[PDB]
Design a binder for this molecule. Structure first.
Ligand SMILES: O=C(O)c1csc(Cc2cccc(Cl)c2)n1
Length: 133
């Protein structure tokens, strides 16, 4: 019952600062433009201790499966090869990515009927809001 309130199909309804977040991460111009136009659906499911997060859009379809607190290797939609760990901290899913001596954190929280995604790297934050599909 770990993530019950996150499970479901979610659609992007708003974004702020995502281009600048992507610049900070190191994403190149063409990828930023196409990725920034995407309107992904995020599909979260749980089977036993394994959580699966899928993101589907015209830009890219991604899927990660993981156990909380157990590191895994991830190829991000922008083609970084990162080492990721996802934990629950006070009801917030905290997804940390480490690569090339750098780090970024993606937090996912339930707030009212929304799922709010906050992405941070070195003072650059982006907030992306999803609603149930
Ligand atoms: O709400 C989302 O769609 C989301 C937040 S963070 C992330 C992962 C990422 C970072 C930089 C470039 C790209 Cl294309 C993807 N995807």
């Amino acid at each position: 019952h770990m993530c019950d309130a996150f499970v479901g199909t979610w659609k992007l309804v708003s974004s702020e600062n995502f281009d600048d977040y992507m610049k900070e991460v190191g994403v190149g111009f063409a990828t930023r433009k196409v990725a920034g136009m995407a309107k992904p659906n995020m599909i979260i499911s749980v089977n036993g201790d394994v959580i699966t997060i899928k993101s589907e859009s015209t830009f890219k379809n991604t899927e990660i499966s993981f156990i909380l607190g157990q590191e895994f290797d991830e190829v991000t939609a922008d083609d970084r090869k990162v080492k990721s760990t996802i934990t629950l901290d006070g009801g917030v899913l905290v997804h940390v990515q480490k690569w090339d001596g750098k780090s970024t954190t993606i937090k996912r929280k339930r707030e009212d009927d929304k799922l709010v995604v906050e992405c941070v790297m070195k003072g650059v934050t982006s907030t992306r809001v999803y609603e149930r599909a």
